[model samples]
Target: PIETVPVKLKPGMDGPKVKQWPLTEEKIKALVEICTEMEKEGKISKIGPENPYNTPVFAIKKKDSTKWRKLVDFRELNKRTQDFWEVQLGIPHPAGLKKKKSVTVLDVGDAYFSVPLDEDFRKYTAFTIPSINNETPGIRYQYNVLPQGWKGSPAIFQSSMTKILEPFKKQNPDIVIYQYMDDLYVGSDLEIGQHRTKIEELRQHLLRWGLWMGYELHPDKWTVQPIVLPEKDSWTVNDIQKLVGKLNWASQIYPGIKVRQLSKLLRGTKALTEVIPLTEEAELELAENREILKEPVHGVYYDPSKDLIAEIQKQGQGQWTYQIYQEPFKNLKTGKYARMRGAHTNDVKQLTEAVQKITTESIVIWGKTPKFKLPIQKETWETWWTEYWQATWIPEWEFVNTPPLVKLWYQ
Candidate 1:
């Protein structure tokens, strides 16, 4: 049986009745149509009498579709409600599924409404809908399911959804399943034929369980393909924020890959909707990151007994790259390391600070003459080294007229 949840309110507290927001005639018609559909589906009920906890109702156009979504102004009610339950907050990192060959994603349609709210507590969610005609009086309606905009609804629905999916999770030991509220991901590392078999098995089980719990998968969002970043030529500040968020999540998942160059895209952003033209530098950084995401590198196991080397060099257009390697042996490409690239003019200080932060007791290899001398003043470099250089910046070589030799054998 599907476990249901209720909107928990503080004892002896209730929201004051609120007047409905003004809407155009066209909007009212849309709202009424949605409300009628909800009423027929038993998701909402027509309230006969006035309730003390009435809140305003409104309609908004859905971004990806032409449908109008009904929303209640539950700010007043939310203030009185107690959000004690901890909600499921983040999506599971995709790095765990890096080895999986087949990854699928499905989103539950009308996710919050899938979980039936407690019958007794439905009165607290009452909302008013204005009449399409001016002469007729408006109608009051209360949700039978968990309604949107309530503070407690997410926690309530998430808990119920998790409880329902627990059995399915245990049943599929071979496949990795991650369910963050309504969004579900199924990943498998099995070979072609076996992967398809496991996926089909999962699909059948979902069809059985999801239907039993009144959950419907979002038609368009369901995808069998692996995750990829959406491409665009130009973006606004809000779009940049979204890209930053995705990159941050990627960084968290793949702690090995770096996106230092992408951080500069938001240098002087003021408004969210203001358009920012995509630059060649940004595109290069994005393409590099995307390549890494497409084919993730194997994880490195650190061995501190071996040598640690830091290489500093100059890249194109006054950009310097610093690489720190935790070498297993003294050979190149034998150790795992992190590299950072930044504009030489603006971020040389940052590059030094990054080196200082990553190198605890590592040997730094300094070329007799670094190519980064141009563009940057010689005094600035010397002053930075003099001011910020620590005992940790111990070089491997000690020049004594002849060839330089290692000063310390072990750190």
Candidate 2:
């Protein structure tokens, strides 16, 4: 989920409201007078045939007939195109030749205006305003729909905002600003003094444009930290697995993550259910997958090949290992064998300690790989970093996990 910064509307202040009124005598008289004056003064070049004078006409198709299909003019073809590449940008490693002492990120917020209102009774005007090149503003209108929903809104807003911040850009040509719609992130690998000054100036310019800064915005969120930022193109399963390993060992970090789902993804099958905790729905889903796997017989109609077997093994292992080894083991040694424990102690503790130690060590070893440093002469690092930066700016909805719904609740 995208982190939403709350902006409260003051009490008693009406943001926007809708009202309905019939085409009565008083309304008709006022509208007719306005139309007559507009037409006589040549403000309106043409007046098309009207059905309902007060209401706007919307194209609608007949439900039962095939002939009366509604034609929609998307106006997509007329939109201006730009040759923009989707690139993923990241800061260069400290070990690199061009490494700097410090880095800064200037976060920019969305524009400061609400969407126009949509009303049937409102007088709608559409026109082509003259431009510098004798061209015209193709289509301009007012409505309740927000600019965020419009296809061209991001580009239009970005272009205008960029022009306003051109001076800052000129001063700090090395500073990079990645913009996605209204959210802007600026970064540079300058010294601490220089970086701080540049970021503050950028923020001042954004404030001048009436944009508000988010309070939660910090260096950690914007900065390319050693642990989080990767020096490679794509993250592999091992990479994520390493993070999970860290989370597992440090139980204090994320105490809320269910071990079952984590284990299922890590391992590839549906075995070890008793060890890992699973929701009723998750258990059922796993059962369904298992049923599908069973249908295709091995080596005859459908072969349960090595890959298939490996997948199942992984899933089963994940559940069993996670549940058994997640906590500290009291009865067993670290090498996978249960140690002789006293009758008074818990066996579960011993199992947990042994499993956790083995899992953490194995995952860490698997995660490490020889970091391939890009050659500085070829500009490979620059190219890769540019692409990484662009990819981060793309507007994408974050994945949200909805808690299971309950039929009833008891205090």
The list of candidate 2 runs beyond 4 A from truth reads 1-151, 214-411
- What's the count of clashing pairs in each model shown? 0, 26
lDDT of 2 by residue, 158-224 (tens): 4456687798879777665544433444545665566677667777776786662321112322211
Residue 149 CA displacement from its true place in model 2, Å? 6.8
Top candidate (TM-score)? 1
The CA lDDT at 49 in model 1 is 70
By summed lDDT, the worst window of 10 consecutive residues in model 2 runs over 306-315
| lDDT tens per residue, model 1, 1-411 | 466654456668765577775666766888889888989998898886756667877665432345665656665675576334323332233444434565554444356676788876788888877765555776888988867655455566655566666776687666665543233556666665676666566566656655311121121222222225768777888777677666675564455445565667688846998988777888887888778766533555434344445444333344333333454212222112124333444455544544443332121111111111122445555444323332111222111122212211110
TM-score of 2: 0.26
Using Cα atoms with residue i matched to residue i, what is each candidate's TM-score against the true structure?
0.39, 0.26
